[PDB]
Design a binder for this molecule. Structure first.
Ligand SMILES: CNC(=O)CN1C[C@H](C(=O)Nc2ccc(Cl)cc2)[C@@H](C(=O)Nc2ccc(-n3ccccc3=O)cc2F)C1
Ligand SMILES: [Ca+2]
Ligand code: NA
Lengths: 234, 43
């Protein structure tokens, strides 16, 4: 996360982190229930094998609340391809159930039609993760968060070298130096309605990070609410 | 529902997400556990 701040205790509870064979974080995920993690299909390619860590706020220190989970089933959307980065979504079923506690709680899934009109029309949402703090720098050792304004789809298409599909939406800033970055992919984008946070996006891609004239691109969760529901019922 | 979300706290006739039950008035939502979806955790 370039810019933004560190999440305080209990502030980003639905955050999960995928760790590789070197025990290093490489993508995020969102806790959906005691058995399921929501992430990006393209992250499945970035590591020969991985586990999921929940409850961590500092990757350089082992603090109470951290726990590791093995993945039992990987459910990748069959239409995902690196050619277009469309359909960038996957669901993971854990071998053992997550115990909810301080810094470990699920984000809520909304109803389709209501989400399109009431959540996607809000002015902002929140993105979080352990990714780079600068386009070419190191990953952050602490969990960070950032408020990102929803961005007009047509303005986004004009600023992009690649096709923006209906399965994606854009968020962030034109020139201000705040955006998500390498390492945050697969992570949550949530939108607050009244006093409940609903998962609305999955960190997907961007040309560089925080570049002038470029925005952050997210997988549009409302377009896959039925897919997620089917996937979670095995 | 096109106005003030039908005065709902969640889904709008109001309603709520799993792990919640609609309050008596039929507008607010009530958590059924210590860790309901969508709420930041307190110590
Ligand atoms: C160094 N990096 C920072 C970039 C990033 O992750 N930023 C970033 C910033 C913000 C948010 Cl929200 C998420 C990621 C990474 C990247 O370059 N992403 C990248 C760029 C373009 C596409 N794309 C789009 C369509 C079709 C084909 C196609 O390849 C896919 C990509 F992976 C490398
Ligand atoms: Ca830690
Ligand atoms: Na920008």
């Amino acid at each position: 996360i370039v810019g933004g701040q560190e999440c305080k205790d209990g502030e980003c509870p639905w955050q999960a982190l995928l760790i590789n064979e070197e025990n290093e974080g490489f993508c995020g995920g969102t806790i959906l229930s005691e058995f399921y993690i929501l992430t990006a299909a393209h992250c499945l390619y970035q590591a020969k094998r991985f586990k999921v860590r929940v409850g961590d706020r500092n990757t350089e220190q082992e603090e109470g609340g951290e726990a590791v989970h093995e993945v039992e089933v990987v459910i990748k959307h069959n239409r995902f391809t690196k050619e277009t980065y469309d359909f960038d979504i996957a669901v993971l079923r854990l071998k053992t159930p997550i115990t909810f506690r301080m810094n470990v709680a699920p984000a809520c899934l909304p109803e389709r039609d209501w989400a399109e009109s009431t959540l996607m029309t809000q002015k902002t949402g929140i993105v979080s993760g352990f990714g780079r703090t600068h386009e070419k720098g190191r990953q952050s050792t602490r969990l960070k968060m950032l408020e990102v304004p929803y961005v007009d789809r047509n303005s986004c298409k004009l600023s992009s070298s690649f096709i923006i599909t209906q399965n994606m939406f854009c968020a962030g800033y034109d020139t201000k130096q705040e955006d998500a970055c390498q390492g945050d992919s697969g992570g949550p984008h949530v939108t607050r309605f009244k006093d409940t946070y609903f998962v609305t996006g999955i960190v997907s891609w961007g040309e560089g990070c925080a570049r002038k004239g470029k925005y952050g691109i997210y997988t549009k969760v409302t377009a896959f609410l039925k897919w997620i529901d089917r996937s979670m019922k095995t | 529902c096109s106005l003030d979300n039908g005065d709902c706290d969640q889904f709008c006739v109001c309603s709520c997400a799993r792990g919640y039950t609609l309050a008596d008035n039929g507008k607010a939502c009530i958590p059924t556990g210590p860790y309901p979806c969508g709420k930041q955790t307190l110590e």
